[PDB]
Design a protein around this nucleic acid. Sequence first.
RNA 1: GGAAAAAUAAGUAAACCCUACCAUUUGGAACAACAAGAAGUCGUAACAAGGUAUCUGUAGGUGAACCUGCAGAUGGAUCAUUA
RNA 2: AUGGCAGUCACGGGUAACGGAGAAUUAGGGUUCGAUUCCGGAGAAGGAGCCUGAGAAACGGCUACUACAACUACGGUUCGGCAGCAGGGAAGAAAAUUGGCCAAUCCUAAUUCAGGGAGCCAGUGACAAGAAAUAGCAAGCUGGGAAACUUACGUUUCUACGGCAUUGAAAUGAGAACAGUGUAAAUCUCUUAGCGAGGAACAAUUGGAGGGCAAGUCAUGGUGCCAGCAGCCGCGGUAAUUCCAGCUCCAAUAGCGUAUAUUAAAGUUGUUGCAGUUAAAAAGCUCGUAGUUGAACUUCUGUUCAGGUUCAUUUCGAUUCGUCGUGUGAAACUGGACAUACGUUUGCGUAAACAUUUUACUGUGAAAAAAUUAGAGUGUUCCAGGCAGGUUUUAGCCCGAAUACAUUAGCAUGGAAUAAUGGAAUAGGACUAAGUCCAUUUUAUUGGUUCUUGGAUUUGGUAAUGAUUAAUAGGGACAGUUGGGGGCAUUAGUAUUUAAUAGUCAGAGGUGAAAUUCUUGGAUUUAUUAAGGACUAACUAAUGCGAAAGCAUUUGCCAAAGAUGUUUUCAUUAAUCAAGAACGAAAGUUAGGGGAUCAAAGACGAUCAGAUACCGUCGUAGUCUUAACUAUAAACUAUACCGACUCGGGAUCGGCUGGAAUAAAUGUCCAGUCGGCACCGUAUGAGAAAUCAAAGUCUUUGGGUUCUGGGGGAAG
Lengths: 152, 129, 140
Amino acid sequence: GRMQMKGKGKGISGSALPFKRRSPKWLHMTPSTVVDLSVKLAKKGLTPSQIGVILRDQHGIPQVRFLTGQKILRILKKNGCAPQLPEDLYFLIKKALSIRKHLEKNRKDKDSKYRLILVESRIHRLSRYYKLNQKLPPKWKYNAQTASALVQ
Amino acid sequence: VKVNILAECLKDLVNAEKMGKKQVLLRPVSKVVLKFLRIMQKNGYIGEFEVIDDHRSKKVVVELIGRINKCGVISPRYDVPLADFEKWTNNILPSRQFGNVVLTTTYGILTHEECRKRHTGGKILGFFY
Amino acid sequence: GVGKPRGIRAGRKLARHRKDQRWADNDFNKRLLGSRWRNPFMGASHAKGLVTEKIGIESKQPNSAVRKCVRVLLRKNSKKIAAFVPMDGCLNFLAENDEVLVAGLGRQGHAVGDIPGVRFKVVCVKGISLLALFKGKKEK
RNA sequence: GGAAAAAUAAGUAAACCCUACCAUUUGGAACAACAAGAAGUCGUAACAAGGUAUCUGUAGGUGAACCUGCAGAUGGAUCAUUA
RNA sequence: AUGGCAGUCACGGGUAACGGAGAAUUAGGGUUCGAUUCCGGAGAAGGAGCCUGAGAAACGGCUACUACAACUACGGUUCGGCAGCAGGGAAGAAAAUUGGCCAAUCCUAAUUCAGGGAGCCAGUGACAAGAAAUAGCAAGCUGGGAAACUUACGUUUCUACGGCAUUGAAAUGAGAACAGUGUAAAUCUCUUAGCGAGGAACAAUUGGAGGGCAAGUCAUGGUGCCAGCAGCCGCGGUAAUUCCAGCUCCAAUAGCGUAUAUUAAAGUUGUUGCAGUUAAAAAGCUCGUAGUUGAACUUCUGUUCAGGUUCAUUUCGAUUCGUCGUGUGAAACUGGACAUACGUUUGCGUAAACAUUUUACUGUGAAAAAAUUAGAGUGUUCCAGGCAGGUUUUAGCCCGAAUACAUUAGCAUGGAAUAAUGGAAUAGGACUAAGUCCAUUUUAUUGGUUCUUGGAUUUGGUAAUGAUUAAUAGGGACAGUUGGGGGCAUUAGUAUUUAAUAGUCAGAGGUGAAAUUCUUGGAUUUAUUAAGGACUAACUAAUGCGAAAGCAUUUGCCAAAGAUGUUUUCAUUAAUCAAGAACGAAAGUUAGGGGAUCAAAGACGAUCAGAUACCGUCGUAGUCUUAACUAUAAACUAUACCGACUCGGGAUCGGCUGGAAUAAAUGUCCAGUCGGCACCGUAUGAGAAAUCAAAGUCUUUGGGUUCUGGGGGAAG
Ligand SMILES: [Mg+2]
Ligand SMILES: [Mg+2]
Ligand SMILES: [Mg+2]
Ligand SMILES: [Mg+2]
Ligand SMILES: [Mg+2]
Ligand SMILES: [Mg+2]
Ligand SMILES: [Mg+2]
Ligand SMILES: [Mg+2]
Ligand SMILES: [Mg+2]
Ligand SMILES: [Mg+2]
Ligand SMILES: [Mg+2]
Ligand SMILES: [Mg+2]
Ligand SMILES: [Mg+2]
Ligand SMILES: [Mg+2]
Ligand SMILES: [Mg+2]
Ligand SMILES: [Mg+2]
Ligand SMILES: [Mg+2]
Ligand SMILES: [Mg+2]
Ligand SMILES: [Mg+2]
Ligand SMILES: [Mg+2]
Ligand SMILES: [Mg+2]
Ligand SMILES: [Mg+2]
Ligand SMILES: [Mg+2]
Ligand SMILES: [Mg+2]
Ligand SMILES: [Mg+2]
Ligand SMILES: [Mg+2]
Ligand SMILES: [Mg+2]
Ligand SMILES: [Mg+2]
Ligand SMILES: [Mg+2]
Ligand SMILES: [Mg+2]
Ligand SMILES: [Mg+2]
Ligand SMILES: [Mg+2]
Ligand SMILES: [Mg+2]
Ligand SMILES: [Mg+2]
Ligand SMILES: [Mg+2]
């Protein structure tokens, strides 16, 4: 299952959403207060996902959308703090670059060359998606040098 | 990679009938799978069945007795004009005397027989006998 | 699985795949490239020729005899051909340099029985049949 | 005024040469196989632990099979011994 | 100006290729042919060019050339062009008469009456098709059956049927003819006088008797592996079921052998429908574009009415050789109707306009070439077949020349499923009101105002304002781990080899024995150091990691990874994959290094008949390393990848979750569970088996996708 690992890649990491869609009974935070916290965290430069984690561990908010009705990114969009490049792609490029970095120096490292090939492969593969779905500028390309200056 | 939910559910079904099992949990499920079951039940093969709402796709428990000799899907879902019916009933079914080839039509999902009585045809789904 | 596409847009790949694999079938291959036309008969059913040699041919194991034969120069081809002469003392009905009518042995390009490698038989001598001559209906 | 011959300019362009190719056949110096068979010659590589276990890749040697180097496979002659 | 076409195969080859209508086979799906009656197209020996016409690049017209045909008094000439008919030559395995007519069918023309090698008629004609003789009935003698009787054999009958180198006359065509039919005439047929049947004639063959394959259980003759048979297996070498013959018998039968292409046989081309662990077959391994393939959710549903269409029958009936009527309920419809519910608005159940995103798909319909094919009607004496026929109501009558099929693409129209695609996420999106522009048909005409209308735009108001889940799909985040995954640095450890410094001495080596070697210049041997290249023992396993190749000393650094844990985030982002790319043992190659061990080549010893081998002593390239190439292995589970589902049991490696003991922890044990590597039982699952928990869920044959195989060699 796990993408681009043929043969044995296949296993199940967890998350399982409970049945109750209604937010929990012990929870006393107004959806507005939540949107406030999430936006504060956001302006502090966090990720929609990282925000999710923070709200869940510290703040007793299990699922933000079942509280608000808006998923975390949509909230970020309306309220204007927006993560210009999708967190998703962002990390993939950060990675491909860390591999670039390490690889320019150790030029005899073959595994990392192959790993790079894989990661860049995924990057393009995500680009197509975010492009056809209008989440990325249409002429936007990942190159070594272009993407290195691209906010990553 | 899941293609054709009808195929999953149908094969798992036949397997459990073949193993002499008394019931089947079936997942995940579609309209088509439920209409296909409503069809086999209406036609006498399976018994009562229950649908389970997990918030996502769904699960379905099927009481079977044992009747089904085989119940298959045909993929791809070919095009079956009224002219071609003869072919498919001779090729797929055990005998003229029984068994059905189910089809999607613009008039809905039908026993091939229901199709002669409705005078239509064209998309083959599966069969059971 | 099955290693073969099933899908309704899969049509050309299917048909092309066959248009390829079909080549492994021998009769198809031999048919499709001219093979017939290049053979000593030039695709034909029989042929006329001249007799170069009367030749004995020792039979394949485990048989011993002397198969009576002839080497013929086909008049259409000018190719040289090794042909068998059937039944008994029919090699006598043949003179060197006659007109002779020659056909396949029934394996379509291959030799039969104990005669090794010889793919053809004699049918007519001058104008007449070997059968006609054998049974002594006519005379040469 | 009409108008035949004859001439004129440009075009259509057959045919014949020269250059360079493609197709279908074909002549040919010089090379030159393969499959089948068995009462020729030298030896015995392989089938049994074929008498050095075979076999694959590669490389070198060499009347002939073949031999030797390195890495590999049991289709092995081992499904197996911490005390 | 720089376009146009191309992996959805351009461009270019090949065709013993003119395209169709169609033909042969056909369970279905297919396969294979169509030079040839009809329709297109092309050409008239090869090219080109023209005249004239309404039409021509004509070719039974002309001009030229190339290549040819006919006359010539040599100078000239041809109404010289068989892929028209007939006929020659040639090629070939292969294909008819130098005939008669316009009577029919039609065509042409100044035209009823003329012409026509179109066409028809005859000849040749085992291309091919249809029907069909080569003998029938009895007698007498019989075989036999059967009864009965007779207790054992005799008799009487012959729904059995047979058999006769015997008797009997009848029957009739092949043949042949007067006549009559038919024809343009001639022939043939058809109708018919006078004729025309008892046996080697009025006589059937062609292939076969071992199996496949119907037919010899010949004490048959010849031949003796010869001659020959035999599609294949095989028969023949002195007793041939297989050759040569005789007898007999079999199979097709006016036909029957043989050769070759093609069809079924063939599930041995596979869509239906095949195979790929070992029979031929999964690509060494990953990434990936074209291509193919894609999770679930939306007017579910209920109630009432009617129309049929089916069903059942303890409802009945009527008649009859089975339909009809009727029940009553029961169905799937079809269509009304109300339910937040397949639409407005207008004119007489049907049109339009408006609105409904497009299509694939499916149901109808139009448009549709005859002959074919399927098929109705019809006794061409049957039949092939033809399109005719049937009737004394006769200066007539009755009836036919159907219908289906007519695939693809266009066209019209009905459609709800399924599949794709759409729509309001920077929204003036939608409805509505009020403004502003740009156009604007009509008001017989131009001008201003307007009106309408139809586009754009600004702003208020109305509405529930508009974002389906969240796949035991996938990407991402994060947290504690885990690993002999990778790259750099570091670092150890004995070991081999060598050297140094000490010792001691005569032998070390090596072998089946030995000999080459080394040795007093002191080897082997002993102790301590040092140099130099490799290599990571033991722990080390049915254990781990890596895409595969492959990866095992310490520590540090660098980037990377799975699994698990998540009430984190994204929201179909995925599967497989021609192109195109990254790797890829060993050996090998190029340019430098390095060189301890082994060690191809080589040098030697031995062994041996010979050893250019196995054994021994040496030894170069190599082995190691930088940069580069190379791309291959039994690169092996000889087993493609993603996804389901089908048995049981312990154990193992990595996470996690509880629980228990202790000496209280990076350790034990117990119970869960997720993911790995496997194993052991077992299958009423699979397979030719060996075997396989997949190699299972396959004639009860279809989850998605690449690849590969089609007897053996030739030959990688
Ligand atoms: Mg999974
Ligand atoms: Mg074949
Ligand atoms: Mg034959
Ligand atoms: Mg043989
Ligand atoms: Mg004879
Ligand atoms: Mg040339
Ligand atoms: Mg040989
Ligand atoms: Mg020999
Ligand atoms: Mg060599
Ligand atoms: Mg053709
Ligand atoms: Mg024509
Ligand atoms: Mg036309
Ligand atoms: Mg002619
Ligand atoms: Mg006339
Ligand atoms: Mg004729
Ligand atoms: Mg005939
Ligand atoms: Mg007469
Ligand atoms: Mg007679
Ligand atoms: Mg014979
Ligand atoms: Mg004899
Ligand atoms: Mg005989
Ligand atoms: Mg083998
Ligand atoms: Mg779907
Ligand atoms: Mg309504
Ligand atoms: Mg040292
Ligand atoms: Mg060292
Ligand atoms: Mg370990
Ligand atoms: Mg070197
Ligand atoms: Mg000796
Ligand atoms: Mg040595
Ligand atoms: Mg614990
Ligand atoms: Mg099989
Ligand atoms: Mg079995
Ligand atoms: Mg087992
Ligand atoms: Mg199959």
